[PDB]
Each structure stands twice: as structure tokens, then as C-alpha cells.
Amino acid sequence: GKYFGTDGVRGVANKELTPELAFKIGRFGGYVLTKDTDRPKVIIGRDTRISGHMLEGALVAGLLSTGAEVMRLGVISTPGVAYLTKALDAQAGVMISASHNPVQDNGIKFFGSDGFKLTDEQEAEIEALLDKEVDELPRPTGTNLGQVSDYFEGGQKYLQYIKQTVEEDFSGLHIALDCAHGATSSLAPYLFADLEADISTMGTSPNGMNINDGVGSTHPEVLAELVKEKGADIGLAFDGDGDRLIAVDEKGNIVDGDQIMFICAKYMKETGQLKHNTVVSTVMSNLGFYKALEANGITSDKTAVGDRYVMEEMKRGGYNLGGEQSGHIILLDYITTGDGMLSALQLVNIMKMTKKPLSELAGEMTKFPQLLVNVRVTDKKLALENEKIKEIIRVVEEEMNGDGRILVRPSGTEPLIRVMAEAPTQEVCDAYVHRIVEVVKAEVG
């Protein structure tokens, strides 16, 4: 086992992600990141999870033990930590959370001083520290010990900063929010009220036990019920830690991350704000999003699946907008990580500046009929080389022109191979899948 997965260390709080481990991540983490600074400084925030406090105590203790200064942020979104760590001139910032996962889980994610994820080489150096039998690092003593303090102003500094990315205010709109009972439970209702909108809220009553429970971006249907009943203009579903956004138009339909990105780029190009007129998405987003995006002279920059990819691509390209189907969207001009509340602001601003309803804005692309089945392989590298699968693809590839896409490929996350088809008809694309899936199943299942 390595410890840092695709986005920090996750695991069940007190059973895999133990206080013991959390401390060590703090100490090795602090030491790695603190190393080459006189006056080292780390900020730390979290979502509303029960285990939040147990892990924050360990992480603070571990940080302090290296000599670093800690600033406690309280409950804040993960983008908030990102923003603040760059803006405060901290060396690193830590966010305790497992995002949309259920309460038992937690996680620890670091941003370094430029507001980005740690370099591989730094993460690596941490992991090797977690590997040694004995801790033989510095033990600063007496008056060389780390100092801690509260920086609860942070959240609102953050708030003021995103708030002012808006044109005029939101008056005349009714906006419903679902804050997943997580990090945005108090921030997002504040922010939208400050912006003069009428609000109805749900999932804004965290108690420690209830984060993401039948609420939030991955269960937006209850919000969609609220939107219809409260007769609202838009619903906004953030996840546990406020990096994803999923919307609901005024008719009750879910408007996903593709639709959101599409609305943003359309309006950004029209306003001359979309750098080099391109949008970055993983290869995993819908074909209709691609064709829509081109119908408006907007060039598409597609990456491997992961958001590290979308992000690295934005950085190198000098791009400006990118993200995934899931509502993780990056407005790199402002925040250095995806931000649900930030992207929700930009969304509501477009409804406002164009005086058009969400169903309309969203309906200016048309998503293709999709179908995705993950099948449980038994080592991908062989199936990736498996002649019968490789040709079952070739056969459906030959069938469509088109006028269709097939996408089959695993990861390292869950071990499984992900067959996915898109065609103008549901029937066809169900049919290519059921096919490609029979072959995989019989050959590797």
C-alpha cells in the first residue's frame, strides 16, 4: 500500500485513517513542506464531518511538532483552503474531508504555496517518511515549537473574493440551495443572500453525522423536488466540501457539469473572457457537449480521466475554464482548484446578464444518449492486450461512422474496465455496450 491516492489520503476515519496516521501525515507533511523556509506556516480547514475534530487535533499536533505555525480555518470549502493558502502566503494548506463520500470516511489533502496540489516528488518524499521504521526528524523544543492560532476571518475573506467576480447582484431571482450539510452549509446561503437573491435552503443543518446523506450533488433529486415546489429559478447542489456543483433548472431537470461548462464557455466567448477560446474536459464528457462546443467556435481540449489531468492541461495551455461531467469545474482565473460556489456564481450571473431561464441556457447544447458499464476485470494490462476484446471494439467501431463514439478503458482506482458508448439512439448504444460487455465478462470476469 501507498498512502496518497488520486486526491490525498482517504479511508474510514479511526479504522484506516486513524488519528495515529493523521498525526504522522501532519508531521512528515509539515516537515517536507516547511523544510526550506525560515518562519514556516500552514493553514488547516475541514468539512462538517464528526471525525473532523479527531483528525484536526492530530494534524495540528503533528504540524506543531516540526516547528510550523498553524492557522485554524474552521469549517470551510476545499477551494477556500486553496485560495487562502496562496493568498495568505502560507507554505501549505490542509483540508480534512472526503468530499461526497458518506460520513465514516475522511481524507487529508494538501495544497502547496501556489495553491496547487503537491508535486509528485513531495508527496513521494512524504510517503517514504511514512515508510521508515523510526521517526528521526527534528524535534524543535521549548521556544522553537510551533505556534497555533485561529484565522476564522479566512472564510469570509474567501467569500468576499469570489463574491466580487460577479457583474451585478442576483435580485429578482429565486435560488434554492442544497449544501449537502457540508462545508458550504453556512457560506453558500450567506453568499447568495448577500447577493440579493430569494433563497430556500436544504441540507444546511450539519450535525456531524449527516453530511452527504440523501442530499448534495450526487443526490440532487430532493433539491429538484424543492425547486419545483418552492417555484424557484435554479437549484444548486454542492457536495460535502464544495468543489463540485450540480444544478437543477426551473422545470426540475438536473443540469450536470457538462451543461454547466457549456453555458460558461458560450457566455465567456461572447464576452471575450474565454482565454484562447478553448475548454478543457476529460475524454469522459458527452459527445453533444463536444459538438455544441464546436457549433460555437470553441475548440475542445480533451484529456485523460482524472482532474489532475484537466488541471495540468489548463496550466500548460494558459486556459481558463475546464472540468468534468460531475460538477468539478475550474475557473482558473480566480481559484486554483474546482469550486462549486464559484462556478454556481458564474452560472447565476449568466442567467442574470442574459435574462434567460436555466432550461433554456442548458438546452442550447443537446447531450447524446449514453451508456456506461464498468465490468470487473482481473488485471487490466492483460485485457488491454486481449485480442478478442480488442476486435469486438473494432467491429462496433466499423458499424458506426460517425455519428458515434465507443470508449473502453480501466483505471488504477477501482481495478475495473469501463465500457461506454454514445450514439444518436439509445437502442444502438445500449446494444454496442451489451455486446462489448458480454465479451469482456466471458474473457476476464
Place this chain on the structure above:
Amino acid sequence: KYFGTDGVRGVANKELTPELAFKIGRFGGYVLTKDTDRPKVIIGRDTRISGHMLEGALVAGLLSTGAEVMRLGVISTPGVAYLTKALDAQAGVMISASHNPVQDNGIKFFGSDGFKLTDEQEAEIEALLDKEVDELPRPTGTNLGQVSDYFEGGQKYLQYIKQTVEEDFSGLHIALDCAHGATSSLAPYLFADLEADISTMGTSPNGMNINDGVGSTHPEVLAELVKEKGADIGLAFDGDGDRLIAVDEKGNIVDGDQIMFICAKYMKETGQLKHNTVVSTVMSNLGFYKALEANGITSDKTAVGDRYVMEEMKRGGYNLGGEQSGHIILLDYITTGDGMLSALQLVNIMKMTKKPLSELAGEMTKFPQLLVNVRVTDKKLALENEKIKEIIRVVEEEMNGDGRILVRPSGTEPLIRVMAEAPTQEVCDAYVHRIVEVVKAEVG
């Protein structure tokens, strides 16, 4: 091993690691939690910088057993003990190393009854502290402990200790030295609220400055303050307010022996000093004992340490005990040494008798005594040694009659304690520094 005789002490982050502290939090928590439902532990600290790191680890540890935790912030140790009896928690923890310099911190526990844990409880935490892997329960999800703040706890403590006095303190001018420690905000409110004139020093903890040039083991700057601002009394507390040492109006130090007497005599005068005995360690000076005898007060003497005094008081139902150091116990009110409490009681006599401190202290006479503490690296080796052991021999059979000696390891600090009392300060000091230079030279 880990458990000294008064918590677990060490220099923060070198011997008292946050790792160790986490364990003490979890294992202790567990041992103290097992036999209750909805379990609850409170936790307070002095002003040492390392207090926060250690709190972080302790709270982690406690939360991980499922216990609920209430954070007190900076508060004196007797306060931790008062509240853990009062708020009906199963334990109170205090993070402090008393009068020690900054590097040092310590962790002391209090039980449901506000007393220090049974040797049986202490032994079992110890016995878990040794175990190979921990197979203690790890509650997950919604069984995890919640934390919250109880930062009014201090005021509740102050309310209590307040009413233990006969009348207000008006027309008295009181100087305080709070050792830049746990009493910093507590003490000044407390006395001010009893309508007294207040001057302060050592009330600006920056986290680095506890006991440093201030507080009860360094009362002189205070002594000057009292004289400078024409005070009626000076009161120096220690880092965590378990000690008091005072200054009379003329600027003379009034130590623990002198306080115990001033209180002892008055308690006796007012028929409220149990069995007319005072418990002390065998460290108090002749003049102390001799002024307790004149006055028909029975002196009861233990071996050295707070543990031994409390036990004695506990067993014989006595209600006033303490040490020369100013660690004084008024059992009727509070379940541990309490500096500020002693203060109130003392200031109380002054006010009730209409007497100034010099004449209260002056009732008893200090005989010549010196205790010098050598800063050493192995108590063990130290005492059983060739260049030290013998000197002691030669001196002893010289005072006869007619003087005395007590040389011994500490139990909680890295020092040896050398003490003599004799018929003159001159011989007394000579007896000691003779040994000292030697310890100083032999054992680092």
C-alpha cells in the same frame, strides 16, 4: 516508568512527545471510560506554547475511544479539578508543568471525585502503555466523540472559590504576579471582584514567558512592586496556580510554612481546623513546627510530595495541609493544592484580624534553612555516588543535637534537592554549597 508522582513530565516534544500524549489520551480515556455510558472528559491547560500541540494529541486520543471532550482553554489546575467534580465528567486532564521553565510540560489526571487517579487506575493506563499493538475499540462513524468548548468554566470556578471568604477585601491594596501562567486572567478578576485595589505583573502570557523571571519561585520582582506601589500584600502564583507565595507590606517573602501557620492559627482560633493538626512534609523548617506547638496545634509530617500530604489529610480527616513551596490544600473547599484559594484565605485573615501581613507572619519565626537544587542528568546514579555520598557522612556527625540534613532525588524534575537547617544561616549555607559545588562538578 511514564507516571512520575504528579502526572507525566518531560520537555515537550523531546520526552513528552505528542505521540506519547495521544496514547495517554486514548489509553487513559479508555481506562477511565469503560465503566460509563455517554462518557465525558474535560481538559485545560496553562499558557505554555507546547500546550496546544499536546492538547491536539490528547483530544485526538480521547475522541478516538468515543468519549465526549470539553475544552476549557487556559485555566488553573485546581480549576480542572473543581470542574471535573462539578460538571459530572468521568475525568479532567490538565496540561501543565507547574513552576517549571517553558520547555517542560506535563499531563495530570483527575477522577470523578476530583482526586488523582488510583494507583490501580494509573497502573492500568501504564499497563496499556506497554502493550504491543493496541486492540482497544475504535468506534467509527456516529460513535465517535464530539468535542466542544466550555470556556466559561473559569468563571464557574471563580464563583465557587469566591464565596469561601468571610467578607469583601475593601481598603486593601493587592499586588499579583500571575507567572504569565494559568491564573493571568483568573486572579485579577477574582480579587478585583472582591473590591480590592489591584496592581499586576506576569499577566501577559505570550506562550514563551511562563515562570520566566516571575511567579512564585521568583517572587523578588514582585517584592519590589509591592514596595514600589506601597501594597498591603503581594501574591505570586506559579505557572499553573497550584502554588502561592506572598510578600508582606515591608517586602519580605512569606513562604508556604508561613502561610500554613497564618491559616492554621486562625482556623484554630475560629474552631474550624480539624483535629487541630496541620499536615506537612518533613521539609518544613523547625521554626514552623515550633510555632505550631506554641499554639497547641499538632504538626503531622509526611515524606516529600503532594501525594503523601493528600493521603494523610484524606486518611485523618484533616483540612489544612501543604509544603514550604506554597502548594497548600484546603480540603474543605477544593480537591487539590490551590494557589488562588490560599490567597483568598490569607487575605481573609488580614481583613478579619485588621492586621498587616508582617505581624501575621511575624508570629512564627523562620530558623536558618537553605535548599539548593542541583541541575543533574541521572538521579539514580547521582545519589549512590562516590564524590557525593561521603561528604554527607562528615557533615551529619557535626550538627548533632543541633541541626539536620536531607539530600534526595526529586521525583518529577531533573534536579537533586540539597537541604540543611542549622543554628545560623552562615553554617547552613556553608553546609549546603559544600555539597552543591560537588554535585555540580560530579553529575553535569
